[model samples]
Target: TTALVCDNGSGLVKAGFAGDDAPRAVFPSIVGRPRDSYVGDEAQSKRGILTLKYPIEHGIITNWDDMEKIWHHTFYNELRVAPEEHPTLLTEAPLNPKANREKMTQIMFETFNVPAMYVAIQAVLSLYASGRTTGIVLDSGDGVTHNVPIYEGYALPHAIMRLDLAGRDLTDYLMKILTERGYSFVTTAEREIVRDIKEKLCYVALDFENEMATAASSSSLEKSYELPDGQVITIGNERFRCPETLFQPSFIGMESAGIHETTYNSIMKCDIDIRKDLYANNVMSGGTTMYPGIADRMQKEITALAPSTMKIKIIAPPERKYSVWIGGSILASLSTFQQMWITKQEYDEAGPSIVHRKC
Candidate 1:
């Protein structure tokens, strides 16, 4: 049977069959309703007031039932694949507890009844998607940013670093500055509008200080966006300022270090023999990392922090926004990995607890 791969995130879920170049279905991880009842994309489009419930938050599953619905929607409505006809491969967040996988394993076996299943770390899978088994994966999403170090397919738990600020935080900061300009977009519905503005206008500044200094005298850095209400707002320093939080969390009042320091620190936590490889293959994944010039900025910052002779390379693939799903696709499609999944026969023998053994 062909494998089904899903990379579930706080913002979206990417799902498709193995060996595919990309996921066939990608939708918000949120389930919403206008009291009329709906979920996923349909719910997201509804106007008026909405009751939105997210299955996952901060890279962990919060509502098991809602998550199951999302999976069901993916299988039956989106991909149109019968659950029992395929083996499954799902990606989990970095430092995910063993108990979470056990619960997911139970669902895949007892509810969906797949032939087999495998739970893999998101960072490692993203690393594989970058075509490397050994590297530091800097995955930044809507909920959080994780600097995970993987060596030979094994993720270093102790060295893993996380920042509380991410894409959502950036949006919030953008809204903050916009509100100061007498804009009233503080409502939940308006937050999505701000998010759209962030996605379309925001970008990381390669030289933050230099950019800020010049912004006062030039209109080139300023952009004007017309909202749905036909009101046009001019965005100036906020465009680069919002994204600066990732590199300087202090701007957002977060205590965590910047992405470059975090990535370099993670690599330093590993043994000296593999540190070079880790530095050479700085893999980037997730939607937040898609900002223009982010990879170049990351490489430039980390290089400055490393030894003068050390070489720094940041790999930002074109498909990095869906890197986790692509990596799961690449892994589960391999003929060698077919034997690695925890089979139903094997699950029936040892039960869901066997996930801890195989995965």
Candidate 2:
């Protein structure tokens, strides 16, 4: 059996036997319906039937049973692998909850009877995927934005900052605006529909105010967005936009902080020299970075905020969606990675203390 890499994010779970072309499976970080237990490709197909429940909320695995079951089926059952056959590599958020981490370790070792496992942080994995030894990673996902500074292959804890704003929050804001305009759409189901529309049509504006002005002045007619259940919604003549929320949350009447401001705040929390270093090596890798104008928008915004003497650059990976998964896959292929994997013998010897130790 080959190594197994489980890349779990706020949006999806990308897992595969190591050495596979890509992830053998990609499941939503969500679960729904007890009888169905939908996940990944199947869950996506059944989107109309079940209300999506993200087991990991705010980047933490809050619903243990749902998450555990999903992982079991997606990895153990689907892959048809006994624990001792292959070691597993799991991705987790930086500054993960200690309790959740402990529970995860217990499940993988005891319940699943896994012989070995290696836990790696998503941001770090992304950085590794970028092939950068040192840099700053601004990761925006479903429920939060993580500003991580990776120096020499490790995340700088003191330089880490998290803003509790993300995709779901943006979706809620969009829903409110649409409802206010008499669009009459609400509910997780409806919100999911709106999110799909937003992803397909929404984009960041270079000059938001100017863009809004253009949108308002344009004579474009309403466009109809088709939903999963064959329902169609005619969106008004307003520009399809959400990335602007990253800079101006007030545009949606949300008191929450914007992504740009939060990013600056996070950078400021770091040491001055380190901050300057980050400006030089800024990297944006996440789902949100896939927004049409995000790279340019972040570069412009951050550059303007920094000193005239300071230089800023924001580079995104080609496959922004699978950045972390690619990184974890690369790590798993490394000769040194074997040292990181904890075997059943070592797990039994180290027990719970394994979670606290570095690889």
Candidate 3:
């Protein structure tokens, strides 16, 4: 049986057979009930009537019952595979509690009866997907953004930095910008439209001051988007300014440092000898990092913040949005990793505690 890679993110659930180049199924990590039931896109479609529930929140699995349905749906409906036939590799967020890891092990081995499984940190997996064992990874999905430094394939936990601002914030900011211009998207259903607009049009500016001045002065920089109601709206400075919140959280009144400073500060907390390597291989992952020219903007910003002689680079792979899942695919498919999986026999003997030692 082929191994399975299931990277359950806060915003999306990515699952597929290992050894594949990318995930075969990616859907929202949410469940909905309109006195009935649905998962992922089906749930999202009935948002106006259904009571939506997110299994994962702020990078932590909050509801195992809802999460189980998501995984069950992925297994039978999405991947079309039997759980017992495959060895599973799951991805976890940075700084996940020990209790949460234990519970995941119990469910995989006891509930699903999978033959073997291993849980790995999302940050390390993302770095591996970028083809680097040592580097700094800035991962931002929906709820939060994390800057983690990895040395020789292990995460530097103490140096890890997190910013609560991320993709959802940009969506809200864009909505606010549009509202200020007299456009309304007040309904719950309309919020999805705003999110889609943010995805299609918002981008980081290489030079915020110059770009804002240019955008405000002329309509040439504006782009038009049609709402669900058949009304078209012109989006001008909002496109660049919305994403600018990531580089300057002050735009939204958050005091946190921008992504560039966050990256530099995280690496600085690591050993001095590896600082150069960390800078040379700064990898970007997760959906929020996909903004147009965002990597180029980070490179420019960090270059200015670093020492005069320091070299700066930001690696933004095309598949970074699924880097954690892709890395799990690559790792779980390797012959060397076969020995790493914690078998059911090992679990029965050593209990779920075996995951801590093996994974």
Candidate 4:
């Protein structure tokens, strides 16, 4: 029995066969259509820049034409997996709309013709990534940041908290800051390069005030960053400031609460007995959390907000960039998880609505 997994982040995505420790193919979620070339990554060739479009947006499949092509490439050109022979597991956003879940089920059963499929909430998968059955999951990815608490094998959908600030917002905020300083990212390609710079260099400061103070007092805070075009620029406070937006969304003028506030609010909604475990078992997954000391910063935030006698433990796996996918990979290999897959026959007989009951 073959098992394929796809953890679709609206901004970035990962896919692989089950039992694999890591994903085989990970790429930008967008499918680009060059005026004269095929629909795919335009950066691979001087094939001229294309008008890029995304299939998934805001945790939903908004465009099938582009998404089907992406899946076609993922299954055929990339992994060479025969869709009909595989049982696929997909990670979905918490509280995923019923209509979208039905749509996803139909796509897998009819379009890809998979033998079986299971749609698991990304938060539950994130909990499994840390080898936990219950915990508070804070996923700060490209499209959005969600604070979801998982219990046993299920997530409390009504208690999930989300915000608009995330990876894309950080990169865009950095671009705005840089623009204020005179260096402009006028094109998508240039902004992509800036994103690379953010990934490599930025980190959540242990103390934002101290970081800014040092950025001002110390000459070394500003390091020279180079673009692919050989143009080198220096960034001072922007390094830590870019990541600070997650903890302090107001930095970018957003009226949303930060992750710590949101996560605390989410856990508070749970039963008092389990709330301690939720804090102690807090598991964070997503690319944005990989910033230097960001995990520690989250702990600090918790320390500042959570009661002193209360607990806070944030466990971050090494490859959190694809932790949700890792969880899917782990689930796919589990004997117990085998029983949870929704077979193609069940899907066909019950129609897409079966996802609500089966998945």
Candidate number with greatest TM-score: 3
Q: In model 2, where is the ten-residue run with the lowest total lDDT?
A: 234-243
Q: Each model's C-alpha lDDT? A: 0.89, 0.75, 0.90, 0.85
lDDT digits (tens) for residues 1-359 of candidate 3: 79999999888999998989989999998899885579988888878788989888878998998888898898989999998989999999898989889999999988889999999999899999988899999999998899999999899999999999988888888888889988888987888899998889888888999998888688877899988779888888888998899889998899999889899899889999999999999999999998898988998999888886878888999888889998999999899889999998999999978988997
Clash count per candidate: 0, 1, 0, 0
Query: Candidate 2 regions off by >4 Å?
Result: 33-53, 77-80, 182-190, 220-240, 252-256
Worst 10 residues of 4 by lDDT: 36-45
List TM-scores for all candidates, in order: 0.94, 0.87, 0.96, 0.94
What is candidate 1's lDDT per residue for 230-254, written digit by digit as tens? Answer: 9888888888888888999888788
**In model 1, which regions exceed 4 Å deviation?**
33-37, 46-50, 229-231
Residue range 1-359, candidate 2, lDDT tens digits:
57888887777778887666468787677776743477665666677777767788767888888888778776765666666577888888888877776778878898888878888888888888777867788888877788888777878787687877677767777677777778877565676777787677666777776766766786463567877779777664333455677677676566866666666776787777677777777777777667777878888888777787887878786786777878888888888778778778877877756876854
- Among all candidates shown, the one with the greatest lDDT: 3
**In model 3, where do residues sit more than 4 Å from their true spots?**
34-36, 228-230
Error in Å for residue 226 of model 3: 3.2
lDDT (C-alpha) at residue 74 in model 4: 80
Model 4: per-residue Cα lDDT over 1-359, one tens digit each: 76999888888779998999999988777776656324334323333456677777766678877777777778887788789999989878877788888888888899999999999888788788888999999988888889999889789887899887788889999989989988888876688888998998888898999889888789787778888989888888889999999988898899989888998999888988888889998888898888988889889988898888887899988888889998899999999888889998788789999988877
Answer with 1 or 2, whichever has the higher lDDT. 1
